Write an enzyme that holds these catalytic residues in place. Structure first.
Site, PDB file in Angstrom:
ATOM      1  N   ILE A  27     -13.385 -16.056 -34.993  1.00 40.66           N
ATOM      2  CA  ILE A  27     -11.928 -15.955 -35.273  1.00 40.66           C
ATOM      3  C   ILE A  27     -11.270 -15.099 -34.198  1.00 40.66           C
ATOM      4  CG2 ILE A  27     -12.113 -16.480 -37.737  1.00 40.66           C
ATOM      5  CD1 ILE A  27     -11.946 -13.584 -38.385  1.00 40.66           C
ATOM      6  N   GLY A  28     -12.041 -14.386 -33.375  1.00 37.92           N
ATOM      7  CA  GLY A  28     -11.469 -13.566 -32.294  1.00 37.92           C
ATOM      8  C   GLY A  28     -12.542 -12.781 -31.611  1.00 37.92           C
ATOM      9  N   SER A  29     -12.151 -12.029 -30.581  1.00 36.92           N
ATOM     10  CA  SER A  29     -13.029 -11.081 -29.858  1.00 36.92           C
ATOM     11  C   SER A  29     -12.164 -10.155 -29.009  1.00 36.92           C
ATOM     12  CB  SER A  29     -14.032 -11.780 -29.003  1.00 36.92           C
ATOM     13  OG  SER A  29     -13.359 -12.436 -27.940  1.00 36.92           O
ATOM     14  N   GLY A  30     -12.819  -9.127 -28.482  1.00 34.70           N
ATOM     15  CA  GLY A  30     -12.336  -8.212 -27.437  1.00 34.70           C
ATOM     16  C   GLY A  30     -13.496  -7.384 -26.914  1.00 34.70           C
ATOM     17  N   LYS A  50     -17.503  -8.276 -37.496  1.00 31.97           N
ATOM     18  CA  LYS A  50     -17.419  -7.850 -36.081  1.00 31.97           C
ATOM     19  C   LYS A  50     -18.785  -7.320 -35.656  1.00 31.97           C
ATOM     20  CE  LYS A  50     -14.216  -5.191 -33.074  1.00 31.97           C
ATOM     21  NZ  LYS A  50     -13.201  -4.116 -33.234  1.00 31.97           N
ATOM     22  N   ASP A 146      -1.884   3.537 -30.095  1.00 34.54           N
ATOM     23  CA  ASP A 146      -2.389   2.301 -29.467  1.00 34.54           C
ATOM     24  C   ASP A 146      -2.129   1.069 -30.337  1.00 34.54           C
ATOM     25  OD1 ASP A 146      -3.428   1.145 -27.186  1.00 34.54           O
ATOM     26  OD2 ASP A 146      -5.354   0.785 -28.210  1.00 34.54           O
TER      27      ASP A 146
HETATM   28  N1  LIG Z   1     -10.798  -8.411 -40.524  1.00 32.59           N
HETATM   29  C1  LIG Z   1     -10.309  -9.371 -39.735  1.00 32.59           C
HETATM   30  N2  LIG Z   1      -9.693 -10.437 -40.303  1.00 32.59           N
HETATM   31  C2  LIG Z   1      -9.170 -11.383 -39.499  1.00 32.59           C
HETATM   32  N3  LIG Z   1      -9.140 -11.437 -38.168  1.00 32.59           N
HETATM   33  C3  LIG Z   1      -9.734 -10.348 -37.649  1.00 32.59           C
HETATM   34  C4  LIG Z   1     -10.314  -9.306 -38.330  1.00 32.59           C
HETATM   35  N4  LIG Z   1     -10.814  -8.374 -37.427  1.00 32.59           N
HETATM   36  C5  LIG Z   1     -10.547  -8.878 -36.245  1.00 32.59           C
HETATM   37  N5  LIG Z   1      -9.896 -10.067 -36.327  1.00 32.59           N
HETATM   38  C6  LIG Z   1      -9.440 -10.922 -35.257  1.00 32.59           C
HETATM   39  O1  LIG Z   1     -10.258 -10.713 -34.129  1.00 32.59           O
HETATM   40  C7  LIG Z   1      -9.449 -10.244 -33.012  1.00 32.59           C
HETATM   41  C8  LIG Z   1     -10.236  -9.261 -32.178  1.00 32.59           C
HETATM   42  O2  LIG Z   1     -10.689  -8.173 -33.022  1.00 32.59           O
HETATM   43  P1  LIG Z   1     -10.635  -6.631 -32.629  1.00 32.59           P
HETATM   44  O3  LIG Z   1     -11.227  -5.830 -33.732  1.00 32.59           O
HETATM   45  O4  LIG Z   1      -9.228  -6.255 -32.201  1.00 32.59           O
HETATM   46  O5  LIG Z   1     -11.569  -6.541 -31.358  1.00 32.59           O
HETATM   47  P2  LIG Z   1     -11.007  -5.575 -30.192  1.00 32.59           P
HETATM   48  O6  LIG Z   1      -9.493  -5.833 -30.033  1.00 32.59           O
HETATM   49  O7  LIG Z   1     -12.001  -5.908 -29.136  1.00 32.59           O
HETATM   50  N6  LIG Z   1     -11.294  -4.044 -30.642  1.00 32.59           N
HETATM   51  P3  LIG Z   1     -10.134  -3.118 -31.335  1.00 32.59           P
HETATM   52  O8  LIG Z   1      -8.887  -3.539 -30.600  1.00 32.59           O
HETATM   53  O9  LIG Z   1     -10.353  -1.654 -30.996  1.00 32.59           O
HETATM   54  O10 LIG Z   1      -9.961  -3.278 -32.866  1.00 32.59           O
HETATM   55  C9  LIG Z   1      -8.186  -9.679 -33.680  1.00 32.59           C
HETATM   56  O11 LIG Z   1      -7.044  -9.784 -32.855  1.00 32.59           O
HETATM   57  C10 LIG Z   1      -7.998 -10.637 -34.847  1.00 32.59           C
HETATM   58  O12 LIG Z   1      -7.352 -11.812 -34.407  1.00 32.59           O
END
Ligand SMILES: Nc1ncnc2c1ncn2[C@@H]1O[C@H](COP(=O)(O)OP(=O)(O)NP(=O)(O)O)[C@@H](O)[C@H]1O
Ligand SMILES: [Mg+2]
Length: 345
Positions: A27-30, A50, A146
């Site tokens: 559903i996503g990543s970073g 995650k 942030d």
């Molecule tokens: N609990 C969740 N429910 C639905 N989508 C989620 C959830 N957690 C993360 N996502 C999706 O996954 C994407 C990336 O997750 P994210 O936790 O932001 O990784 P990140 O940006 O690498 N680390 P961080 O920014 O510090 O939280 C988010 O923009 C959402 O689109």
């Protein structure tokens, strides 16, 4: 212990998860790693998982992982994502690699919402929830600094949760770029901050929900600062004197701007303004923007005042706005054990 777990490929990544977690879908990543939706057979509901790959890799990943793990375990608020479960599939500290965070599954991040026209009811409600979450973090002594659309998530029923806990009080070898566009002048110019640092970010997101374009884009903070002053105008003198003398010289010496008025920044074009209801809500939204997007934090609206703003306060619930409720430096081996002990307890 490993027969508690199974492995599936999700993109390049292998998810090794508890057997309760079925039918993983990305559903996503970073930078931290990949996020999947799953069915949790034990809870009989969908969850987000995650994966953090070797979060003890470097100080920055390690600090963030440790902080996020401690904070989402102890923080409890309807507008902050809840941790349902935490595990590693590795049996010992020596074998320890990966941390899986299991959260309630939300439907979308705010990036997807920004691409939509929202009525005033949905926009004001989203903004109200963001402010209740920030309020709760502030009351627990957490100033995020942030907030960005990628780490705010929403459901179909317009419920909103903040995913993350912001910056600590950071060299990395990745392709991954930090999104800086929502960072307050206090952060851009490193000039000390209070609670309403987070109001700047709310104003940037709200602005973007209305314009459907990032307010303050830039390759770096130089560009981003130009975009801030090009629109809001060069700030006032009492602002400058709060700046480090090196930064102060820099800001004091940029090409000046009176800047644009809030009507020109957010024209009537951008709001529902057919009905008398929508006309009044457009002027209230623009008012609130004019108060959040204020360079000088001395003159920028607080969280408490924003919650009392007529655009927001139609939602105001004392239950949601009032509820009572680390920063050190280690080697990768010390961070590994700190993170491990948190995952196990
Ligand atoms: N609990 C969740 N429910 C639905 N989508 C989620 C959830 N957690 C993360 N996502 C999706 O996954 C994407 C990336 O997750 P994210 O936790 O932001 O990784 P990140 O940006 O690498 N680390 P961080 O920014 O510090 O939280 C988010 O923009 C959402 O689109
Ligand atoms: Mg994020």
């Amino acid at each position: 212990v490993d027969n508690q777990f199974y492995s599936v490929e999700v993109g390049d990544s292998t998810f090794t998860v508890l057997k309760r977690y079925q039918n993983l879908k990305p559903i996503g990543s970073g930078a931290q790693g990949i996020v999947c939706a799953a069915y949790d057979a034990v809870l009989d509901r969908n969850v987000a998982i995650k994966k953090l790959s070797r979060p003890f890799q470097n100080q920055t990943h390690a600090k963030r992982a440790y902080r996020e793990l401690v904070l989402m375990k102890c923080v409890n608020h309807k507008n902050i994502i809840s941790l349902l479960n935490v595990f590693t599939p590795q049996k010992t500290l020596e074998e320890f690699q990966d941390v899986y965070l299991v959260m309630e599954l939300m439907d979308a991040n705010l990036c997807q919402v920004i691409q939509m026209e929202l009525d005033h009811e949905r926009m004001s409600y989203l903004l109200y929830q963001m402010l209740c979450g920030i309020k709760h973090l502030h009351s627990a002594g957490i100033i995020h600094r942030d907030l960005k659309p990628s780490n705010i998530v929403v459901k179909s029923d317009c419920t909103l949760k903040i995913l993350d806990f912001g910056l600590a009080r950071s060299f990395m070898m990745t392709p991954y770029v930090v999104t800086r566009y929502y960072r307050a002048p206090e952060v851009i110019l490193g000039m000390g901050y209070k609670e309403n640092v987070d109001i700047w970010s709310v104003g940037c997101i709200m602005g973007e929900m209305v314009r459907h374009k990032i307010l303050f884009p830039g390759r770096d903070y130089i560009d981003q600062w130009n975009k801030v002053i090009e629109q809001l105008g060069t700030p006032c003198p009492e602002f400058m004197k709060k700046l480090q003398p090196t930064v102060r010289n820099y800001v004091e010496n940029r090409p000046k701007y009176a800047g644009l008025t809030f009507p020109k920044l957010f024209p009537d074009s951008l709001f529902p303004a057919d009905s008398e209801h929508n006309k009044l809500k457009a002027s209230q939204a623009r008012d609130l923007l004019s108060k959040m997007l204020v360079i000088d934090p001395a003159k920028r609206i607080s969280v408490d005042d924003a919650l009392q703003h007529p655009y927001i306060n139609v939602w105001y619930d004392p239950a949601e706005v009032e509820a009572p409720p680390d920063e050190r430096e280690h080697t990768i081996e010390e961070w590994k054990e700190l993170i491990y002990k948190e995952v196990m307890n």
